[PDB]
Nucleic acid binder design. Sequence first.
DNA 1: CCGACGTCGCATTAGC
DNA 2: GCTGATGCGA
DNA 3: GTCGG
Length: 327
Amino acid sequence: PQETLNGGITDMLTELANFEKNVSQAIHKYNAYRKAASVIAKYPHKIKSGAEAKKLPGVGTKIAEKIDEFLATGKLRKLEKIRQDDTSSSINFLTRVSGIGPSAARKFVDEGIKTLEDLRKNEDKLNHHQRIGLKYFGDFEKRIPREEMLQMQDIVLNEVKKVDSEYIATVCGSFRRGAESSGDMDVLLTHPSFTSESQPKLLHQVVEQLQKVHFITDTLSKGETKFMGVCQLPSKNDEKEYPHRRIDIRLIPKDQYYCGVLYFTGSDIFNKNMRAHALEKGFTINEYTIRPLGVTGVAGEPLPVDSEKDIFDYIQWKYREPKDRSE
DNA sequence: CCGACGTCGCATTAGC
DNA sequence: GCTGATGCGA
DNA sequence: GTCGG
Ligand code: NA
Ligand code: NA
């Protein structure tokens, strides 16, 4: 299934989704439109009617209506109107700044702050996160080619090992699945000395090292288990600079690591099926552990996990490579 | 018909 | 000050 | 907004 097949419908729903999240502050309506957008995006025929589309899981009466209006007129009256609305369109746009959500965007627009120019005119009213989001607004919306991800991984793995050779790091996300580009870099970190029953600087030391070699350029948030920040590859001599990229690093206990690696490798749809599989085998998987039920439904103790495949073994499924984890 | 819809670490601010 | 709720991103 | 108990 291609773009031109139902792109006008999926773009319509995605737009509606964004206005729900950012303007109406209705997070569940936001997800509902997206779920409709997703299932339609995968549908292998040019939709002829709203009724045809309503058969799909996630498409109800209201979206079937909108599809019927779109097909007949090439537009949606409500979407046209809200696009044209200065207040709403500005609130929606401002949320594209990292750190500016629906609430902060509303306040800015309430007091006349509506554009990037206005934001740059009013730094004093931005928190640390939002200034960074403003500074790298364009960079953060770019894709990351796999070649650059590999170069970034080279640096991360190298420096992590230099701090302590007993560290274990894994770049997860769609990168580990072999996607040809990424939205960011998600790093999962662990150490033999850090377990569930179980220093307060295991993560700090790694962040500090990546900063010393000037890979990590900025910090959005930093605690004892989770770092969120900005990084950049070294300029390849006299050539143009690389865009700044978003990078997350999390420290996970050794006994929860591969459950963490499994979850943050994805995809969402794969994860959902593997948690459905799964319960029907009498197990419950979260991002941290896998646990047995339990005849009356009571969750028992977390089972020991020493690899990804270990989780598969518990639930009667053969191990599937991240390359094959789209669903 | 009416509640669920993912969950949580971190930054920031509320109320006291 | 401290205790907790909220916003945000993922 | 959609699903389902
Ligand atoms: Na449906
Ligand atoms: Na934002």
